[PDB]
């Protein structure tokens, strides 16, 4: 598994409240409750906003670094250290 669950304390570039109609934005429960729905959907907009960095070997998470190695045949077998893999894939 990978445990790519939701992340606490993350905002969104598409607030649910900001798309609500006028007058509607005057309530107390509506604004607070619908903001809660942003928490579950927040991190999806993060990966869409930052997808270019999800492919650069020098910064992308470790899992993809091994996967990125298979794109250009980096011979990643036998290395159990993350920083060693970082140079190999980019320089392959």
């Amino acid at each position: 598994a990978s445990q790519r669950g939701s992340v606490d304390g993350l905002g969104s570039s598409l607030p649910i409240a900001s798309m609500l109609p006028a007058v509607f934005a005057d309530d107390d429960l509506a604004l607070r409750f619908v903001a809660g729905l942003d928490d579950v959907l927040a991190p999806i907009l993060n990966v869409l906003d930052c997808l270019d960095t999800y492919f650069d070997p020098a910064l992308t998470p470790a899992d993809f670094a091994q996967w990125l190695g298979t794109w250009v045949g980096a011979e990643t077998d036998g290395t159990e250290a993350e920083p060693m893999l970082r140079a190999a894939v980019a320089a392959a």
Binding site: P21, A22, V23, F24, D27, L29, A30, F33
Partner: protein, 122 residues
């Protein structure tokens, strides 16, 4: 006679035991209008025609021409978007002093014959 159904409420609130409270009956059809008249024909791009183009008429002169266009504007919208209601006259009256226009709408759920007027209690 017309079925009125049930649903949420505009200012929503926890209720007696928890969750969210659901209101029906003559109170409900009173809540649907408040949403319909408040929102301008916009601010909900997926459904643009919904709303009331009241605001484009703001700042017109205080004549029966402005009052006349008001009657036609409310009449079409209340018919289009809220069909569980029969509308009985709209009243435009000067308020404090030749300054603001009060829209008084008398209505009744179809087949019930219970005259009622929208109040918009803040």
């Amino acid at each position: 006679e017309q079925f009125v159904g049930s649903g949420w409420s505009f200012p929503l609130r926890i209720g007696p035991t928890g969750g969210i409270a659901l209101v029906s009956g003559e109170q409900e059809v009173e809540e649907a209008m408040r949403l319909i008249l408040a929102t301008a024909p916009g601010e909900r791009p997926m459904r643009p025609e919904f709303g009331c183009a009241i605001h484009d008429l703001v700042f017109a002169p205080v004549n029966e021409q402005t009052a006349g266009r008001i009657q036609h504007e409310v009449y079409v919208t209340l018919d289009r978007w809220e069909p569980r209601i029969e509308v009985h006259d709209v009243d435009v009256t000067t308020g404090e002093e030749q300054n603001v226009l009060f829209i008084d709408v008398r209505y009744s759920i179809r087949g019930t014959n219970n005259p009622r007027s929208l109040v918009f209690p803040f």
